[PDB]
C-alpha cells in the first residue's frame, strides 16, 4: 500500500498526517515536499527523468493508494496535480484509491476532495466512497502527530481501502 | 488585460489559442510554457524569487484576465494550479476573469472549467458567466492558429470580459 503527501511544504500539516499513516500501517510513502518534481512540460526527455520513472513505477506496483492533499484555493495542491500529469490511466486503472484532504477549518476540504476525486476518475482509479477532511484541530503540528478522535476515522478509511484492494 | 497560457507544453495547443488572443487584442501575456516556476513550497525565500514577484505584479496590475488551461485528467494543468498557489485573493479580489479550457472529445472540457471556476472563486475572482471549450480540431498547431469558428466565440468572450472590467 502506498501513501502520498500532497503538501509541498516541509512544515505542512498534510505532511504530518501522511507520515502518521505511512508509519502506523508501515506503508510505502512519496512525500512531495521532499520528492520535488519539475513542472510537467509534456516532453519525452522528462519521462526519462529518474524521479518520474520512480513515481510511475511505485504507483503501478501499489496495490492500494492513499491520496492526501491540502486544500489550496478550493482545490488540490498544484504540486500534486502536477505529479499526476506525469502519470495516466496506465498506472491508475482500477487502482484502489482513498482520498484525504487537509482543510484549514469550516466547510473547507469539500472542493479539494471533489477535485481529487474528479481527476482520479479521469485516470480510471477505483476511488472508494470513504473520504476524509482534516482540520488543523486534528493536527498536533509541534508534537508532529495526529489527534486521537480522528485516529479511528483514518483506521476505518485504511481498512476499507484494503477491502477494496482485495475485491474491486 | 492579461492572458495566461495554462499548458506547459511549448508544443501545446492551449499555447496557440493563448497567443492568438494576446495578439488579436494586443494584451499582456504570461506563457507558462516559457514562464517556468518552481513547485510551490510555502517558503518565504521562494516568495522573493523574481518570476514570483513578476507573477504577482503582472496579475495585480491586470484590469482583466483571460485564463486558458488544457484539460489534464479532468482538471486544470498542474503547472497552472501551481502558479495559482503562489497567489491569493490579494491579487484576484474582484478581478474580472474569463475562462477557457482546451479539450477534445465532446465529453471533455467541463471538468477543467468547473475546477478553474471553483478555484478562481476560492480567491474571490469575478468570474464572468461566459466560459469556452476549444476542441483540438479547431486549433492548427503547425500553422499556429485557430479555426474561424472559434474566433467569433473568442471575440464574444473577450468583449463580454471588457464589459465587466468597465462596470
Ligand atoms: C496557497 C494556499 C491556499 C490555501 N487555500 C485554502 C483553501 O482553499 N481552503 C482551506 O481550507 N485552506 C486553505 N489554505 C490553508 C491550508 O488549508 C492550511 O495551511 C492547511 O493546513 C494545509 O496545510 P499544509 O499545506 O501545510 O499541508 C491555503 C493555504 C495555502 C498555502
Ligand atoms: C497530461 C495530460 C492529461 C490529459 N488529460 C486529458 C483530460 O483528462 N481530458 C481531455 O479532454 N484531454 C486530456 N488530455 C489531452 C489534452 O486535452 C490535449 O493535449 C489538449 O490539446 C491540451 O493541449 P495542450 O496541453 O498541449 O495545450 C491530456 C493530455 C495530457 C498531456
Curated annotation (Swiss-Prot), chain A:
The keyword Cell membrane does not apply. The keyword Hydrolase does not apply. Its EC number is 1.7.-.-. FMN binds at residues 7-9, 13-14, 71-74, 104. InterPro entries: Flavoprotein-like_sf (IPR029039), FMN_Rdtase-like_dom (IPR005025), NAD(P)H-dep_reductase (IPR050712). GO terms for cellular component: cytosol. It is an enzyme of class 1 (oxidoreductase). GO terms for molecular function: FMN binding; identical protein binding; oxidoreductase activity. Its cofactor is FMN. Keywords: Flavoprotein, FMN, NADP, Oxidoreductase. Induction: Part of the yhcYZ-yhdA operon that is induced by the two-component regulatory system LiaS/LiaR in response to cell envelope stress. Belongs to the azoreductase type 2 family. Homotetramer. Catalyzes the reductive cleavage of azo bond in aromatic azo compounds to the corresponding amines. Requires NADPH, but not NADH, as an electron donor for its activity. This is FMN-dependent NADPH-azoreductase. It comes from Bacillus subtilis (strain 168).
